Design a protein around this ligand. Structure first.
Ligand SMILES: NC[C@@H]1O[C@H](O[C@H]2[C@@H](O)[C@H](O[C@@H]3[C@@H](O)[C@H](N)C[C@H](N)[C@H]3O[C@H]3O[C@H](CO)[C@@H](O)[C@H](O)[C@H]3N)O[C@@H]2CO)[C@H](N)[C@@H](O)[C@@H]1O
Ligand SMILES: NC[C@@H]1O[C@H](O[C@H]2[C@@H](O)[C@H](O[C@@H]3[C@@H](O)[C@H](N)C[C@H](N)[C@H]3O[C@H]3O[C@H](CO)[C@@H](O)[C@H](O)[C@H]3N)O[C@@H]2CO)[C@H](N)[C@@H](O)[C@@H]1O
Ligand SMILES: NC[C@@H]1O[C@H](O[C@H]2[C@@H](O)[C@H](O[C@@H]3[C@@H](O)[C@H](N)C[C@H](N)[C@H]3O[C@H]3O[C@H](CO)[C@@H](O)[C@H](O)[C@H]3N)O[C@@H]2CO)[C@H](N)[C@@H](O)[C@@H]1O
Ligand SMILES: NC[C@@H]1O[C@H](O[C@H]2[C@@H](O)[C@H](O[C@@H]3[C@@H](O)[C@H](N)C[C@H](N)[C@H]3O[C@H]3O[C@H](CO)[C@@H](O)[C@H](O)[C@H]3N)O[C@@H]2CO)[C@H](N)[C@@H](O)[C@@H]1O
Ligand SMILES: NC[C@@H]1O[C@H](O[C@H]2[C@@H](O)[C@H](O[C@@H]3[C@@H](O)[C@H](N)C[C@H](N)[C@H]3O[C@H]3O[C@H](CO)[C@@H](O)[C@H](O)[C@H]3N)O[C@@H]2CO)[C@H](N)[C@@H](O)[C@@H]1O
Ligand SMILES: NC[C@@H]1O[C@H](O[C@H]2[C@@H](O)[C@H](O[C@@H]3[C@@H](O)[C@H](N)C[C@H](N)[C@H]3O[C@H]3O[C@H](CO)[C@@H](O)[C@H](O)[C@H]3N)O[C@@H]2CO)[C@H](N)[C@@H](O)[C@@H]1O
Ligand SMILES: NC[C@@H]1O[C@H](O[C@H]2[C@@H](O)[C@H](O[C@@H]3[C@@H](O)[C@H](N)C[C@H](N)[C@H]3O[C@H]3O[C@H](CO)[C@@H](O)[C@H](O)[C@H]3N)O[C@@H]2CO)[C@H](N)[C@@H](O)[C@@H]1O
Ligand SMILES: [Mg+2]
Ligand SMILES: [Mg+2]
Ligand SMILES: [Mg+2]
Ligand SMILES: [Mg+2]
Ligand SMILES: [Mg+2]
Ligand SMILES: [Mg+2]
Ligand SMILES: [Mg+2]
Ligand SMILES: [Mg+2]
Ligand SMILES: [Mg+2]
Ligand SMILES: [Mg+2]
Ligand SMILES: [Mg+2]
Ligand SMILES: [Mg+2]
Ligand SMILES: [Mg+2]
Ligand SMILES: [Mg+2]
Ligand SMILES: [Mg+2]
Ligand SMILES: [Mg+2]
Ligand SMILES: [Mg+2]
Ligand SMILES: [Mg+2]
Ligand SMILES: [Mg+2]
Ligand SMILES: [Mg+2]
Ligand SMILES: [Mg+2]
Ligand SMILES: [Mg+2]
Ligand SMILES: [Mg+2]
Ligand SMILES: [Mg+2]
Ligand SMILES: [Mg+2]
Ligand SMILES: [Mg+2]
Ligand SMILES: [Mg+2]
Ligand SMILES: [Mg+2]
Ligand SMILES: [Mg+2]
Ligand SMILES: [Mg+2]
Ligand SMILES: [Mg+2]
Ligand SMILES: [Mg+2]
Ligand SMILES: [Mg+2]
Ligand SMILES: [Mg+2]
Ligand SMILES: [Mg+2]
Ligand SMILES: [Mg+2]
Ligand SMILES: [Mg+2]
Ligand SMILES: [Mg+2]
Ligand SMILES: [Mg+2]
Ligand SMILES: [Mg+2]
Ligand SMILES: [Mg+2]
Ligand SMILES: [Mg+2]
Ligand SMILES: [Mg+2]
Ligand SMILES: [Mg+2]
Ligand SMILES: [Mg+2]
Ligand SMILES: [Mg+2]
Ligand SMILES: [Mg+2]
Ligand SMILES: [Mg+2]
Ligand SMILES: [Mg+2]
Ligand SMILES: [Mg+2]
Ligand SMILES: [Mg+2]
Ligand SMILES: [Mg+2]
Ligand SMILES: [Mg+2]
Ligand SMILES: [Mg+2]
Ligand SMILES: [Mg+2]
Ligand SMILES: [Mg+2]
Ligand SMILES: [Mg+2]
Ligand SMILES: [Mg+2]
Ligand SMILES: [Mg+2]
Ligand SMILES: [Mg+2]
Ligand SMILES: [Mg+2]
Ligand SMILES: [Mg+2]
Ligand SMILES: [Mg+2]
Ligand SMILES: [Mg+2]
Ligand SMILES: [Mg+2]
Ligand SMILES: [Mg+2]
Ligand SMILES: [Mg+2]
Ligand SMILES: [Mg+2]
Ligand SMILES: [Mg+2]
Ligand SMILES: [Mg+2]
Ligand SMILES: [Mg+2]
Ligand SMILES: [Mg+2]
Ligand SMILES: [Mg+2]
Ligand SMILES: [Mg+2]
Ligand SMILES: [Mg+2]
Ligand SMILES: [Mg+2]
Ligand SMILES: [Mg+2]
Ligand SMILES: [Mg+2]
Ligand SMILES: [Mg+2]
Ligand SMILES: [Mg+2]
Ligand SMILES: [Mg+2]
Ligand SMILES: [Mg+2]
Ligand SMILES: [Mg+2]
Ligand SMILES: [Mg+2]
Ligand SMILES: [Mg+2]
Ligand SMILES: [Mg+2]
Ligand SMILES: [Mg+2]
Ligand SMILES: [Mg+2]
Ligand SMILES: [Mg+2]
Ligand SMILES: [Mg+2]
Ligand SMILES: [Mg+2]
Ligand SMILES: [Mg+2]
Ligand SMILES: [Mg+2]
Ligand SMILES: [Mg+2]
Ligand SMILES: [Mg+2]
Ligand SMILES: [Mg+2]
Ligand SMILES: [Mg+2]
Ligand SMILES: [Mg+2]
Ligand SMILES: [Mg+2]
Ligand SMILES: [Mg+2]
Ligand SMILES: [Mg+2]
Ligand SMILES: [Mg+2]
Ligand SMILES: [Mg+2]
Ligand SMILES: [Mg+2]
Ligand SMILES: [Mg+2]
Ligand SMILES: [Mg+2]
Ligand SMILES: [Mg+2]
Ligand SMILES: [Mg+2]
Ligand SMILES: [Mg+2]
Ligand SMILES: [Mg+2]
Ligand SMILES: [Mg+2]
Ligand SMILES: [Mg+2]
Ligand SMILES: [Mg+2]
Ligand SMILES: [Mg+2]
Ligand SMILES: [Mg+2]
Ligand SMILES: [Mg+2]
Ligand SMILES: [Mg+2]
Ligand SMILES: [Mg+2]
Ligand SMILES: [Mg+2]
Ligand SMILES: [Mg+2]
Ligand SMILES: [Mg+2]
Ligand SMILES: [Mg+2]
Ligand SMILES: [Mg+2]
Ligand SMILES: [Mg+2]
Ligand SMILES: [Mg+2]
Ligand SMILES: [Mg+2]
Ligand SMILES: [Mg+2]
Ligand SMILES: [Mg+2]
Ligand SMILES: [Mg+2]
Ligand SMILES: [Mg+2]
Ligand SMILES: [Mg+2]
Ligand SMILES: [Mg+2]
Ligand SMILES: [Mg+2]
Lengths: 159, 172, 56, 185, 56, 58
RNA sequence: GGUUGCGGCCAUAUCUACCAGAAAGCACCGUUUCCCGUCCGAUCAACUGUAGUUAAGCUGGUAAGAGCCUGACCGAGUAGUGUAGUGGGUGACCAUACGCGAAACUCAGGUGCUGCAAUCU
RNA sequence: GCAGUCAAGCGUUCAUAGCGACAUUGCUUUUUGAUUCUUCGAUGUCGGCUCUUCCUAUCAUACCGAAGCAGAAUUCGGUAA
RNA sequence: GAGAACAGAAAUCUCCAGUAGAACAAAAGGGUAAAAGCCCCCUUGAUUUUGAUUUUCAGUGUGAAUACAAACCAUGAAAGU
RNA sequence: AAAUAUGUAAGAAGUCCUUGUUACUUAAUUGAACGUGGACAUUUGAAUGAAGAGCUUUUAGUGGGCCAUUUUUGGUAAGCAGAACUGGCGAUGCGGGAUGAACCGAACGUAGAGUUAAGGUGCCGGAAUACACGCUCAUCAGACACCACAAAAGGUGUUAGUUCAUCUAGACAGCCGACCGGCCGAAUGAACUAGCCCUGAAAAUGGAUGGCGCUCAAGCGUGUUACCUAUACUCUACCGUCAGGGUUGAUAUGAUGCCCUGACGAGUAGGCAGG
RNA sequence: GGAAUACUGCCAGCUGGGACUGAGGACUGCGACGUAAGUCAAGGAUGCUGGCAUAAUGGUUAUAUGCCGCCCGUCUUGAAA
C-alpha cells in the first residue's frame, strides 16, 4: 500500500539543524506582524502546533490576519492551470520576516532623497536601475608586470 | 583547427579592489582564427590557474609571423594526446619552412597514424632544432645529408580528354 | 550602432529582418556545431558580418 | 515556417452589424455607422456598438431608472438615451419632464412620459438634434438581473441556484443540502 | 589598449521552428526571432547576455 | 488485462494552452477568516466614522 | 574597566589543565523560634551579616592543547552538473564546445560581541 | 548446448603429448524459460511414412600435421558437407 | 569507572563521569534535557455553540488536523497553557 | 554540500505628514485597523516582448496510447515491464537515412526565380575519377549516427610513440691476429604503448557497404575549396483567411458593397462557416 | 633602414555576361539634373522591328519516354499487410 499522510517525506525537511535544537529563542516570539507583512514560511519541528503543511515550506506570502499566537498568511499555489488562494493559520515559530521587500523600501527612500538633489540642483535623475554593462576600454600597464608565458603540462601519473 | 595561425594571446584575471594589477599571462596558440585562439587560451589557463573566462579578461591578441619563412628548418614537436585507452606524450620531428606549416602537418600525422583528432591533442612545445646532429628522428635525417639528390620514378600525368590516342609513359 | 538612449524603441520599431540563406553556402559542412568547433551556431564575433552580408 | 506566438486566422469576438433583419434597425445603423466615422463624437461609436446588441444585452430600461438618473446632480435637463426599449413602472409617482430618445417605448412608458410633458425621441431624431450626442445621458438596463444568469457557475459551495423544474420540499433539499442528511453543499 | 567590450550584437536564427525546448523556444520569441534565417539587433547587457548563450 | 498506470506526460502542455492564469487581485480584498471581534468592532469603528462625515459636510 | 539583576545573539561563549585576582558585588559561610520542605535544615524554607573565607563557585590569563568561529587564484576550476553535435569507443566509458561549480585537503588568523539598569580606588 | 583465455594442478620426470581447478571473455538458437508483436469473421495440433534440399559444431571415406606415434591400435589437429 | 555485613555475574547503598548514547502505547521517521523524559499534586479543554482554514480535492464528500470567536471549566504565585 | 529546477518582491492599490471614528486594544491620545485633510515626477522607479487586455455562456471528441535523448525502478536480458523532463509519432505530407510511424533537416494555399538545410557529388544519380598529408593489401579487407552486433586473448604484418639499459672514455653487426686488440664510424639491446590490418570468428533457399564495382581507393583519419537539390529561407504574381484604414458629399448599374494596407495558410477525432 | 607584397576589411568606386519578373493603369507622393525653358532611371515597361490565318499558338485525348506512385474501407500505439 501507498502512504501519503500529512508529514510523509518530511524526514530531512522538518529536521532541526546540526547543533541547533531544543527551545526556540525569543527573537521569534518578540517579533510583531501586522496585516500586509510579507513573510517567508519555514516549519519548525520543535513546535508541532500550528505548523505549515510541507508544501508551503519555502513559500512566501502576505499575512491576512493576526490572532493570539498565530498569523493567517494568504499564499498562492497552482492547481491544474491557475493559482488558487490558500490561506494558512501558522504560528510564529514557523514564520520569518521576509527580506525580499525590505530593501525595496530602502530603495524608494533613497530614490526620494536623490530626487531632492535634482530639486536643489537640477541634474538628471537616473532613478530606475540598469543591469550590468559591457565595461569599457582601459589600458593595462606592462610596468612591473610583464606577461609570463605558459605552455601545457605533459602527462604523468601521480599515484 | 583548419589552416593554421600563431597567436600571442595575453590575458589576466579581472582586477579587484583588493588586487589591482593582477599578473598577465601569455600563450602561443595555434588556431585557425582569433575566436578559436581566444577560446583555446581559456581552455589551457583553466587547466593551470584558477580562472574562468567569466572571472578574467583578455588583454591582447596578436598574430605571430614566421621570422624566416623561406628558410628550411628542423622542428622538434612535443605533443600530449589522449588515445582510445589512455593519454600519453610524444616527441616528433617535422621539417618545414614555418611553425604553422609544421603544426599544420603535425595534426595530420596525429590524425593519420594515431587517429588523434584535434580536440584530443595538446601541443606542449614546438621549437626549432638548433643545429643538425641534434636531430633525433631518422625520417628527418635522410634529407640532412650532403648533396642530396633523388629521382621521382613512375610519372603519372593527369589527362583531360577522357580518351587518349597513345599508350602513355611514366619516364620523367 | 551607437546604441544610446532610445535604442529600445528605435530597434523595436524595426521589423525583424527577413533574410535569404547565405549566398555561397555556410562555409561549414554542418551548421549546428558551435562556431569554435564546426562552424555556425554561436557567437562568431566579427565574423557575423561576412555571414549576414551574404544573407543579404 | 513560423513559430506562432498567437493563433492564426482568429476573428475578434465582437459583432459588426446586428443579427437582426429589421430594415429600420439596419437603417439606424447605416446612420450611426456614418456618424461615428465622420465625427469626433465618442458617443456615436458607443451607440453604434450598442445597436448590434442582442435582446439579452439590451435589457429594458425602466422609466424609474430614467427618473432617478435625472435626479443625478448636474444632469437634470439632459436628454437621456437608451439604445433599447423603455418600460413603464407604476412604482413611482412624481416623474419629471425631460425627453427620452430610445428605440422603443412601451405604451405605458410613452404615454406616461408625455403626461409629465416630455418627448419620446427616436434615435435619428436624437441624431439630428444632437449630431455629436452632446448633453446626452446614456442609460443601461441590468443584464445580470436575468433568470438564466442565476444558475450560471453552479458548483459546490457557490450558493447559486440549480436548474430545477418543480420546487418545494421533496425537491433537492435533503442529502447535500443539510448537515442532517449527508453533508451540506 | 584593451578595447571596450561590444555593446551591440546581431543575432540571426539559423535553426528551424521544429523540436525546440520550451525555455530556448520562449527566448527566441522574446528576441523576436520566430522564423528561420531572420535576425534582430540586441543591446548587450548581462540581462540580454543571458538571453543569448541560452539561445546559443 | 494489464495497462498503463499513471503519467504526467503532456499535462504541462495542456496546462499552458489557456493556462497558468494569475491570482487576479483587487484592492479591498475580502475579509474572510479574520478575527471576529476585530471584524465586529471594525463594523462600529466604521459605523461611527460615518456620522463624522454625516456631520462635517452639513 | 571590574560587579551584579534582567537580557539579545546562543562555543570567537564549550572542554581539559594550570596559575592570577585590589575595590566593591557575588558567593562560600553562621543560625534553627517562626512560615516552610525533606529519610536527612544536604537541596527547599526562615533568621542574622553578626562568628569566619577566596579554598571553591565566579572573573581573567597561560596551552607549537581539544573543539569551535574566520579567511584564501590553498587543493580545485578538480568532483559533480546545465546546454550541444550524424564527436570518439564493440562496449564500459570518454573527449571537446557554451556555461555553473563543490566537500575533503592545506596554509593562515581569531577564542565571545553586546543591551537596559545599578554599583564600586 | 558449444568454444575460448590465464595456467594452480594431472600426466613417474615433466603446466600445455593428452588434460585442467579457481576465475574470466564468448558463441549458438535442434533446450527451457522470459515476453505477448503477428494471427481468435480459424495459418489443420504428436509421431511416423515419403521426398528433396541446405547447415557443419566430421561418425566414415580422400590428403595431411601432432603424440607420452617402435609395430599394431589409438588419440589431438588441418583442408574437407 | 571507583567504593560497602552476608551479597556471588546478578539484590541494596555512594560518589564521579554522562548532548541524550534513555524514555515518550505501537510501525517508522521527526521532535523534546531546569522537558515532551522520571516522580508527585490537583483536575475532566476526551465539555458547550457554531462558522472559517490545511491535507487529500473536482478545490465534492469523508477521515485527520490548524487558527479563531462565544460561553462555561481545569491548573498555577502568576504570565500562561 | 552543488549544478539544474523552485516561492517572493522591483511602486500612483507608492512612500510619507496630520488627526476623526470604535463596543476591539493599552499604564495611558498607548495601539490596531478604517477614515479626514496635506508632500513628492521627468528613468514612474530592472531587461525583453506583447501579433491587444479582461470576462461569460455553452458544447464536440477524448478518457487502450506509443517512440527518441536524458535522469530512473524491477529483470541475466528483451523489439520486456514500470516512472520523471522535454521533444516527437499518433493526427503529417515534404528533403535526407536505399528500404522504414517515431532518426537528421524542415513542417505544407497556387506559381516563377534565387539560395540553402540534413545528406551527398566514380557509375547506377543531380554534383570535382577535386586538391592535400599519412595510414591500410585482408585465400569473407573496408566503406559513416540511430542501424541492422562481436569479446577476452594473441601477431618477429606494418606504422608512429614510450621507457630502461649499452655507445665517440668508439659500443652494436661485419672482416681481420668466452676474452682482448686492428679497421669501420653511429648507433644498439630489452620491455612496452596504440594505429590499420591478421588470428580469435561455427548454421541451415542463393544475396547483398542499396547495387555495380573500387587497392598512392571509389577504403580509414585529417585538412581546404568548388559543386548538387526540399513543400524550408529571400523577391515577385495569383487564391483564400484574419486584421486595420478610407468611402453613396455623389453622378445609375450592388453599403451584405467599392477601394487601400499588413500578416497568415499542416491536420485524424471533432466544432463552425460558406456553398 | 626604406619599400613592396600577402592577408582581413571599407568605398553612398567604374564597368562586362546570364537568368526570372513587367503586378498597376488620368493626375495627386518623395525626389534628383537644371542659369533657365525644361529633362529624368524619381509612388510597378515602354520604344522599335518582324512573324500567323492550308494557320501560328492554346485545350483535350491516345501513345511513347524520364522520374515518381503498394488496396481501399476499418480497428489499431502501429495495416500494402
Ligand atoms: N485631453 C483631451 C481629452 O479629450 C477627451 O475626449 C476626446 C478625445 O481625447 C477622446 O478620444 C479617445 C477616447 O474616446 C477613448 N476612450 C480613449 C482614446 N485614447 C482617446 O483618443 C486619444 O488618444 C489617442 C491615443 O493616444 C489619440 O490617437 C487621439 O487623438 C486622442 N483623442 O474622446 C473624445 C473625442 O471622441 C476627454 N474630453 C478628456 O479625457 C480630455 O479632454
Ligand atoms: N405560482 C403557482 C404556484 O406555485 C407554487 O410554487 C411556488 C411556491 O408556492 C413554492 O413554494 C413552496 C410551496 O409550494 C409549499 N406549499 C410551501 C413551501 N415551504 C414552499 O417552498 C418555499 O420554501 C422552500 C424551502 O423550504 C423553497 O425551496 C421554495 O423555493 C419556496 N417557495 O415554490 C414556488 C416558488 O418558487 C406551486 N408549486 C404551484 O402548484 C402553484 O400553482
Ligand atoms: N550503462 C550504459 C550507459 O551509461 C551512461 O552513464 C553516463 C552517466 O553515468 C554519466 O554521464 C553524465 C550524465 O549523467 C550527466 N547528467 C551529464 C554529464 N555530462 C555526463 O557526463 C559523462 O558524459 C559526458 C558526455 O559528453 C562526458 O563528457 C563526461 O566525461 C562523462 N562523465 O557518465 C556516463 C557517460 O559517460 C548512462 N547512464 C546511460 O547512457 C547508460 O546507462
Ligand atoms: N582393414 C584392412 C586395412 O587396415 C586399415 O587400417 C586402418 C585402421 O586400422 C585404422 O583406421 C582407423 C579405423 O580403425 C577407425 N574405425 C576410423 C579411423 N578414422 C581410422 O583412422 C585412420 O584412418 C583415417 C581415415 O583413413 C585417417 O584419417 C587416420 O589418420 C587414421 N589413423 O588405421 C588404419 C589406417 O590408418 C584400414 N582399416 C583398411 O583400409 C585397410 O584395408
Ligand atoms: N498610472 C496613473 C493612473 O491614474 C488613474 O487615474 C485616472 C482616473 O482615476 C481619473 O479619473 C477621474 C475620476 O477619478 C473622477 N471621479 C471623474 C473624472 N472625470 C476622471 O477624470 C478623468 O476622466 C475624464 C473623463 O473621461 C477625463 O475627461 C479626464 O481627462 C480624466 N482626468 O483620471 C485618471 C486618468 O486621467 C488611476 N488612479 C490609476 O489607473 C493609475 O493610478
Ligand atoms: N484611538 C483613537 C485614534 O487615535 C489616534 O491616535 C492614536 C494613534 O493613531 C496616534 O499615533 C499617531 C498615528 O495616528 C499617526 N498615523 C502616526 C504618528 N506617528 C502617531 O503618533 C504616535 O507616535 C508619536 C511618536 O512617533 C508619539 O509622540 C505619539 O504620542 C503617538 N500617538 O496616537 C494615538 C495613540 O498612539 C488618532 N488620534 C485618531 O486616528 C483616533 O482618535
Ligand atoms: N562489405 C562487407 C564488410 O563487412 C561487414 O560485414 C562483415 C561481418 O558481418 C562479418 O564478420 C563475421 C563475424 O561477425 C562472425 N564471427 C562470422 C565471420 N567469420 C566474420 O567474418 C569476418 O571474418 C574475419 C574476422 O573473423 C574478417 O577478416 C572478415 O573480413 C570478416 N568478414 O563478415 C562480414 C564481411 O566482412 C559489412 N557487410 C559491411 O559493412 C562491410 O563493408
Ligand atoms: Mg511508501
Ligand atoms: Mg535542514
Ligand atoms: Mg542546511
Ligand atoms: Mg496537540
Ligand atoms: Mg578575425
Ligand atoms: Mg595555481
Ligand atoms: Mg618537454
Ligand atoms: Mg596512461
Ligand atoms: Mg629529445
Ligand atoms: Mg612522420
Ligand atoms: Mg586532454
Ligand atoms: Mg592529357
Ligand atoms: Mg592522345
Ligand atoms: Mg593505342
Ligand atoms: Mg552557387
Ligand atoms: Mg552541408
Ligand atoms: Mg563534403
Ligand atoms: Mg551577395
Ligand atoms: Mg544575397
Ligand atoms: Mg507558410
Ligand atoms: Mg447591482
Ligand atoms: Mg448583484
Ligand atoms: Mg455560504
Ligand atoms: Mg422553478
Ligand atoms: Mg444522519
Ligand atoms: Mg450524518
Ligand atoms: Mg560581450
Ligand atoms: Mg530585439
Ligand atoms: Mg554584459
Ligand atoms: Mg483490465
Ligand atoms: Mg488506462
Ligand atoms: Mg494500479
Ligand atoms: Mg479556449
Ligand atoms: Mg548550613
Ligand atoms: Mg536558602
Ligand atoms: Mg582563588
Ligand atoms: Mg586551538
Ligand atoms: Mg575573525
Ligand atoms: Mg556516441
Ligand atoms: Mg566545462
Ligand atoms: Mg542560474
Ligand atoms: Mg562563487
Ligand atoms: Mg573561552
Ligand atoms: Mg551448439
Ligand atoms: Mg606434478
Ligand atoms: Mg614434457
Ligand atoms: Mg532444461
Ligand atoms: Mg499479442
Ligand atoms: Mg504468441
Ligand atoms: Mg486470418
Ligand atoms: Mg487464432
Ligand atoms: Mg483454412
Ligand atoms: Mg496451408
Ligand atoms: Mg479440418
Ligand atoms: Mg503442437
Ligand atoms: Mg571446419
Ligand atoms: Mg579430421
Ligand atoms: Mg559414432
Ligand atoms: Mg615423453
Ligand atoms: Mg589401442
Ligand atoms: Mg577401433
Ligand atoms: Mg573432440
Ligand atoms: Mg552434399
Ligand atoms: Mg558516556
Ligand atoms: Mg553516541
Ligand atoms: Mg505524554
Ligand atoms: Mg519513535
Ligand atoms: Mg531521535
Ligand atoms: Mg540540550
Ligand atoms: Mg489569564
Ligand atoms: Mg480622535
Ligand atoms: Mg513593446
Ligand atoms: Mg466540452
Ligand atoms: Mg467524458
Ligand atoms: Mg477506450
Ligand atoms: Mg512497447
Ligand atoms: Mg517496438
Ligand atoms: Mg535496436
Ligand atoms: Mg505491453
Ligand atoms: Mg517502455
Ligand atoms: Mg527528471
Ligand atoms: Mg525527439
Ligand atoms: Mg502532431
Ligand atoms: Mg512530421
Ligand atoms: Mg523519402
Ligand atoms: Mg540506413
Ligand atoms: Mg524517409
Ligand atoms: Mg539534434
Ligand atoms: Mg554525374
Ligand atoms: Mg560524415
Ligand atoms: Mg555496421
Ligand atoms: Mg538480425
Ligand atoms: Mg575487430
Ligand atoms: Mg584486442
Ligand atoms: Mg602491433
Ligand atoms: Mg618480441
Ligand atoms: Mg616493432
Ligand atoms: Mg646517444
Ligand atoms: Mg648491421
Ligand atoms: Mg631502440
Ligand atoms: Mg549468414
Ligand atoms: Mg557487396
Ligand atoms: Mg553508401
Ligand atoms: Mg569485383
Ligand atoms: Mg570487389
Ligand atoms: Mg558513391
Ligand atoms: Mg581520405
Ligand atoms: Mg573545383
Ligand atoms: Mg512554393
Ligand atoms: Mg473594414
Ligand atoms: Mg487550414
Ligand atoms: Mg492550423
Ligand atoms: Mg480540414
Ligand atoms: Mg474529419
Ligand atoms: Mg463558395
Ligand atoms: Mg639603411
Ligand atoms: Mg624605421
Ligand atoms: Mg582586398
Ligand atoms: Mg560618377
Ligand atoms: Mg500592366
Ligand atoms: Mg516634383
Ligand atoms: Mg539643380
Ligand atoms: Mg531647383
Ligand atoms: Mg522643376
Ligand atoms: Mg507591330
Ligand atoms: Mg498534345
Ligand atoms: Mg516506383
Ligand atoms: Mg474492421
Ligand atoms: Mg484487429
Ligand atoms: Mg492491437
Ligand atoms: Mg487512434
Ligand atoms: Mg505495447
Ligand atoms: Mg488500410
Amino acid at each position: 500500500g501507498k502512504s501519503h499522510g500529512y508529514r510523509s517525506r518530511t524526514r530531512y525537511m522538518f529536521q532541526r539543524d546540526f547543533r541547533k535544537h531544543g527551545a526556540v529563542h525569543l527573537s521569534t516570539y518578540l517579533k510583531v506582524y501586522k496585516v500586509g507583512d510579507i513573510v517567508d514560511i519555514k516549519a519548525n519541528g520543535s513546535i508541532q502546533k500550528g505548523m505549515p503543511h510541507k508544501f508551503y515550506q519555502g513559500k512566501t506570502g502576505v499575512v491576512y490576519n493576526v490572532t493570539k499566537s498565530s498569523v493567517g498568511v494568504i499564499i498562492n499555489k497552482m492547481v491544474g492551470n491557475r493559482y488558487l488562494e490558500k490561506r494558512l493559520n501558522l504560528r510564529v515559530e514557523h514564520i520569518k520576516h521576509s527580506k525580499c521587500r525590505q530593501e525595496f523600501l530602502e530603495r524608494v527612500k533613497a530614490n526620494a532623497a536623490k530626487r531632492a538633489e535634482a530639486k536643489a540642483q537640477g541634474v538628471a535623475v537616473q532613478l530606475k536601475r540598469q543591469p550590468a554593462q559591457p565595461r569599457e576600454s582601459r589600458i593595462v600597464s606592462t610596468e612591473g608586470n610583464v606577461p609570463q608565458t605558459l605552455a601545457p603540462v605533459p602527462y604523468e601519473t601521480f599515484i | 583547427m583548419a589552416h593554421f595561425k600563431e597567436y600571442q594571446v595575453i590575458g589576466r584575471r579581472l582586477p579587484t579592489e583588493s588586487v589591482p594589477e593582477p599578473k598577465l599571462f601569455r600563450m602561443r596558440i595555434f588556431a585557425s582564427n582569433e575566436v578559436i585562439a581566444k577560446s583555446r587560451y581559456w581552455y589551457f589557463l583553466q587547466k593551470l590557474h584558477k580562472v574562468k573566462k567569466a572571472s578574467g579578461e583578455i588583454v591582447s591578441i596578436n598574430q605571430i609571423n614566421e621570422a624566416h619563412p623561406t628558410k628550411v628548418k628542423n622542428f622538434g614537436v612535443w605533443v600530449r594526446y589522449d588515445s582510445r585507452s589512455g593519454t600519453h606524450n610524444m616527441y616528433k620531428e617535422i621539417r618545414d619552412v614555418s611553425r604553422v606549416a609544421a603544426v599544420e602537418t603535425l595534426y595530420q600525422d596525429m590524425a593519420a597514424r594515431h587517429r588523434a583528432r584535434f580536440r584530443s591533442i595538446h601541443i606542449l612545445k614546438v621549437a626549432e632544432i638548433e643545429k643538425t646532429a641534434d636531430v633525433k628522428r631518422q625520417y628527418v635525417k635522410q634529407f640532412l645529408t650532403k648533396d642530396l639528390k633523388f629521382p621521382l620514378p613512375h610519372r603519372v600525368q593527369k589527362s583531360t580528354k577522357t580518351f587518349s590516342y597513345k599508350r602513355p609513359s611514366t619516364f620523367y | 550602432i551607437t546604441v544610446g538612449p532610445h535604442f529600445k524603441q528605435a530597434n523595436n520599431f524595426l521589423w525583424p529582418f527577413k533574410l535569404s540563406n547565405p549566398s555561397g553556402g555556410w562555409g561549414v559542412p554542418r551548421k549546428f556545431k558551435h562556431f569554435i568547433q564546426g562552424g555556425s551556431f554561436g557567437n562568431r564575433e566579427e565574423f557575423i558580418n561576412k555571414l549576414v552580408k551574404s544573407m543579404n | 515556417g513560423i513559430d506562432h506566438t498567437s493563433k492564426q486566422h482568429k476573428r475578434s469576438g465582437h459583432r459588426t452589424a446586428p443579427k437582426s433583419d429589421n430594415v429600420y434597425l439596419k437603417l439606424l445603423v447605416k446612420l450611426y455607422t456614418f456618424l461615428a466615422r465622420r465625427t469626433d463624437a465618442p458617443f456615436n461609436k458607443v451607440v453604434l456598438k450598442a445597436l448590434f446588441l442582442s435582446k439579452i444585452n439590451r435589457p429594458p430600461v425602466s422609466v424609474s431608472r430614467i427618473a432617478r438618473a435625472l435626479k443625478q446632480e448636474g444632469a437634470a435637463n439632459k436628454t437621456v438615451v437608451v439604445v433599447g426599449t423603455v418600460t413603464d413602472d407604476a412604482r413611482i409617482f412624481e416623474f419629471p419632464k425631460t425627453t427620452v430618445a430610445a428605440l422603443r417605448f412601451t405604451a405605458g412608458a410613452r404615454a406616461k412620459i408625455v403626461k409629465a410633458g416630455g418627448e419620446c425621441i427616436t434615435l435619428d431624431q436624437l441624431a439630428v438634434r444632437a449630431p455629436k450626442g452632446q448633453n446626452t445621458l446614456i442609460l443601461r438596463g441590468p443584464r445580470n438581473s436575468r433568470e438564466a444568469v442565476r444558475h450560471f457557475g453552479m458548483g459546490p459551495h457557490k450558493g447559486k441556484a440549480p436548474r430545477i423544474l418543480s420546487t418545494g420540499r421533496k425537491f433537492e433539499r435533503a442529502r447535500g443540502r443539510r448537515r442532517s442528511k449527508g453533508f451540506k453543499v | 589598449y584593451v578595447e571596450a567590450q561590444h555593446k551591440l550584437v546581431f543575432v540571426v536564427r539559423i535553426k528551424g521552428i521544429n523540436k525546440i525546448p520550451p525555455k530556448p523556444r520562449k527566448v527566441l520569441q522574446l528576441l523576436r526571432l520566430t522564423r528561420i534565417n531572420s535576425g534582430t539587433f540586441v543591446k548587450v547587457t548581462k540581462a540580454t547576455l543571458e538571453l543569448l548563450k541560452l539561445i546559443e | 488485462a494489464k495497462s498503463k498506470n499513471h503519467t504526467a506526460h503532456n499535462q504541462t502542455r495542456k496546462a499552458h494552452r489557456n493556462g497558468i492564469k494569475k491570482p487576479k487581485t483587487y484592492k479591498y480584498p475580502s475579509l474572510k477568516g479574520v478575527d471576529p471581534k476585530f471584524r465586529r468592532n471594525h463594523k462600529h469603528a466604521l459605523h461611527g466614522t460615518a456620522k463624522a462625515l454625516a456631520a462635517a459636510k452639513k
